[PDB]
Symmetry: C3
Subunit: 112 residues, 3 copies
């Protein structure tokens, strides 16, 4: 395990009624695509390798502007994304294909 494993999953949740242990919640409807895990932490200078498996039914994106990373993983495909974390800081990991509050963003933290 010299690299990170990230699974992109789609979640289609429709629960018009939920009563658990006597507590009730109504009209729940949320659709989202998640990166699991969302956060990747590395040291400055580290050679980063992220094996992204897209389990979403559609093509998904993986982007980190700071390091020119911008990929599109086909549905069911697995792509290894590699780059060198030559800059310290916090950088958003996002999908350039869907609304950010649908396919929620993650973070790449490069510590000193």
């Amino acid at each position: 395990e010299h690299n990170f494993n990230v699974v992109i999953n789609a979640y289609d949740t429709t629960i018009p009624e939920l009563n658990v242990e006597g507590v009730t919640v109504k009209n729940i409807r949320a659709f989202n695509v998640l990166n699991e895990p969302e956060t990747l932490v590395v040291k400055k200078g580290d050679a980063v390798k992220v094996v992204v498996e897209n389990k979403s039914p559609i093509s998904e994106g993986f982007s980190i502007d700071a390091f020119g990373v911008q990929e599109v993983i086909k549905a069911g495909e697995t792509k290894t994304i590699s780059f060198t974390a030559d800059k310290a800081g916090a950088f958003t990991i996002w999908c350039q294909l869907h609304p950010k509050n649908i396919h929620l963003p993650g973070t790449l933290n490069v510590v000193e």
Copy 2:
């Protein structure tokens, strides 16, 4: 020693105007771990005090280190394990949909 509070949010806002900006038909139910992210160095022992403020029992799991607990509503449970592996691991609830009780991350840095 970490402190994570699990909170549930039942938000419903058909319409609301603030600073001249109108938002409509907002309906969202979610359970969240606060904080969501935990960062440790490889090899050190981890003690996570999880306080569940959700009205129902919640889950806290991290497969890589065989962690998986069910915390009753209003209860507090101390999770302890050793981060003997470096990487990024999903902290999730095994009881509810992933996009309802949003996942977090345990990062084990070398």
Copy 3:
């Protein structure tokens, strides 16, 4: 040394999503996101966070552990700074809106 966090509002409504043969219906989600959500520093570090608010309304940026309770006017930028003198994981949240609308983040102070 100076992080860059951008707060964005998203008003998403998709009656019917149709892409590559997949169909999802009645999608509606309104959220405010801090981008990036996670900040990792070392104990004792002087932290500076340039918070740019792209939200059409006032937004909050708070970190209880370090007495950070700030409000950023719509479309304005504010530099928040403090010393991370305690190790741990601390919630970065908005004190103005519901936690599940304006999703929380984390400030991680490692030894």
